[PDB]
Structures are given as structure tokens and as C-alpha cells.
A paper describes a structure:
Especially, exposure or modification of N-terminal amino acid residues can mediate protein degradation and the resultant proteolytic procedure is called the N-degron pathway (formerly the N-end rule pathway). Two tertiary degrons, Asn and Gln, are hydrolyzed into the secondary degron Asp and Glu by N-terminal asparagine amidohydrolase 1 ([name]) and N-terminal glutamine amidohydrolase 1 (NTAQ1), respectively. In this study, the crystal structure of [name], the last veiled structure among three amidases in the N-degron pathway, was elucidated.
Although yNta1, NTAQ1, and [name] do appear to share catalytic functions commonly involving a conserved Cys residue critical for the deamidation activity, they exhibit low sequence similarity to each other. And we explain unexpected substrate specificities of [name] based on structural and biochemical analyses.
Residue numbers in the entry:
A (entry chain A): 2 to 114, 117 to 305
B (entry chain C): 1 to 4
């Protein structure tokens, strides 16, 4: 079940009421919101895109920080087993929470090496008029509570707790966070370097791919692929609409996206028309694009 | 975020 201050969380319940009734949750939200956004470099960084999963442990000599950004209606979820330090960061967008939460639990439960407990952290979203952030909170908290293992909710800064306003337009306060694998510290972060195959991985998400695990902790390898998707519908119609038309239909929050969001969409849409059948083309021998950290902490092809 |  899902525990807070040692007691089971009653559902359904808004995260605002849950945070208001438990001082440790309220304190954590105040600290996280009051932080300045840290510009995290690429050294030892494993950036997690939307609808992606990454899990590692402090025994990893290549990954120091897991991070994700550009969360408007989605939620960044961090599951950590204290003691052994097995840490999993996912960027959930409400596509299939019934299957994504077991993916998070199995990524951590596979680490056998009593000591410590399971702690979960939920950050992201705002008071969007489509209610996508509130439904993701309801879904994530419900499926974590259905697990048989005791999961202790430590961080909860979602929806109305993560909402700011600027001339009657609402948008998130925290767009992204980073987690230090060794010290378990979570903080607001921005990422200028977001790893290799960004457009290929963004196209896989735009085409409708499910949540995937992108990192193999044993070999310390970033494995990208092989991917296969159906041709995106009307790629040239969407590529020729104006920036307002693209935000209203291809984004979940047309007025809350970070700047240059339409630049990223058009780049992603051009990739899908460039590669409608990518399985046999971008992956030679049906093998994944494997990357490893090098001496300077940057991803390099192997 | 990316929509449907």
C-alpha cells in the first residue's frame, strides 16, 4: 500500500489535501518550489524523455544524476529504495498507468541487495483546464497503493501544488527535476544536453510508443532501439499548420509549454515523415543503438 | 507534453 507518516493513504483524495494534512509533505513542497532551477551539465547525466524509464544504483560508475524536463501535464516519478540506493526515474504522461507503475516496481524489486524502505516522489503538472494532471495523480496514487509492498510517499508536488499564474494563464512552477543517485537529493533542474538520439526517441513518443526502459545498469549501457511505429497520420498537414494550430492539437497544454516547443514539434514531425518505416532502416541487424559513458562523462557510441 |  501507499504510506504517509506511517499510516495508509485514504483514496480518493486531492494531493493538496494530502499535503496540507501531513507537515513533512508540506515542508518538502515548500523547499522544492523555492529552489532556483539548476542548470545540470551532461557529465554523468542520464536524461529521461517523456514516456521513458531509467533505473540504476549508486554502484554505477557512469551515472550520477537522473533527470527529466518539459513536464506540463505529465508527472516525473522517482522510486528509490533507501540503503541499496536503487533509483528509478520515469516521466509518466497518463498513457497507460496500469502498466507503467508495475514497470517501475519491477525495475526496483529486481535489486536483491531488510535495510531501508521504498520511497516514491511525484512532481509535475498544474491546474490545466483538461484535468490531465489531476487524473494522472489519481491514477498514480491508486496503482501505487494497490501494490503489496509498503511504499512511503515522501515528495508530492503536483497539480495545484505546482501551479503558478501570469496574467490569467496557468502553467507549472517545476518543469523538471534531477535526482543524485548517491545522495538521494531531488532538486529543480534544467538540462541543455539531453543525450543522444533525442529526435529519434521523441519521434517514438509522438508516434504512440509505450513506456520503455532505456538503460541497462549491469552493462552500464544506454540502449536506444530497435523502434517500429505506424506512419504518423497527416505529417505534412500538421507540418504546414501555424504554431498556434500545432500547440492546440499536438500538445496537452497549448499555453503552458516551455519556449521553442513548436520548434521541437516541427523537428520531430519532420523526422516521422523522413522515417515512416524505421525498424529495418535505423537499426542494422535489428540491434539497439548502444551508448556508454566515457572518461569525460559523455555518452559515446559503442 | 506530446498529445495523443
Amino acid at each position: 500500500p501507499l504510506l504517509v507518516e506511517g499510516r495508509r493513504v485514504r483514496l480518493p483524495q486531492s494531493a493538496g489535501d494530502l499535503v496540507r494534512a501531513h507537515p513533512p509533505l508540506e515542508e518538502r513542497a515548500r523547499l522544492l518550489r523555492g529552489q532556483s532551477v539548476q542548470q545540470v551539465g551532461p557529465q554523468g547525466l542520464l536524461y529521461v524523455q517523456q514516456r521513458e524509464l531509467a533505473v540504476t544504483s549508486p554502484k554505477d560508475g557512469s551515472i550520477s544524476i537522473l533527470g527529466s524536463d518539459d513536464a506540463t501535464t505529465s508527472h516525473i516519478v522517482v522510486l528509490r529504495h533507501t540503503g541499496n540506493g536503487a533509483t528509478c526515474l520515469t516521466h509518466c504522461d497518463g498513457t497507460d498507468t496500469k502498466a507503467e507503475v508495475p514497470l517501475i516496481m519491477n525495475s526496483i524489486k529486481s535489486f536483491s541487495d531488510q535495510c531501508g524502505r521504498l520511497e516514491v516522489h511525484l512532481v509535475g503538472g498544474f491546474s490545466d483546464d483538461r484535468q490531465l494532471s489531476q487524473k494522472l495523480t489519481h491514477q498514480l496514487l491508486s496503482e501505487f497503493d494497490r501494490q503489496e509492498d509498503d511504499i512511503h510517499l515522501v515528495t508530492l508536488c503536483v497539480t495545484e501544488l505546482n501551479d503558478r499564474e501570469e496574467n490569467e494563464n496557468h502553467f507549472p512552477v517545476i518543469y523538471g527535476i534531477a535526482v543524485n543517485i548517491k545522495t538521494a537529493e531531488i532538486y529543480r533542474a534544467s538540462f541543455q544536453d539531453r543525450g543522444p538520439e533525442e529526435q529519434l526517441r521523441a519521434a517514438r513518443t509522438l508516434a504512440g510508443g509505450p513506456m520503455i526502459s532505456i538503460y541497462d545498469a549491469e552493462t552500464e549501457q544506454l540502449r536506444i532501439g530497435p523502434y517500429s511505429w505506424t506512419p504518423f497520420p497527416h505529417v505534412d498537414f500538421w507540418l504546414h499548420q501555424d504554431d498556434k494550430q500545432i500547440l492546440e492539437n499536438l500538445s496537452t497544454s497549448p499555453l503552458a509549454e516551455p519556449p521553442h516547443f513548436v520548434e521541437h514539434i516541427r523537428s520531430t514531425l519532420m523526422f516521422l515523415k523522413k522515417h515512416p518505416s524505421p525498424a529495418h532502416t535505423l537499426f542494422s541487424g535489428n540491434k539497439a543503438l548502444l551508448y556508454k559513458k566515457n572518461e569525460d562523462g559523455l555518452w559515446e557510441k559503442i | 507534453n506530446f498529445a495523443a
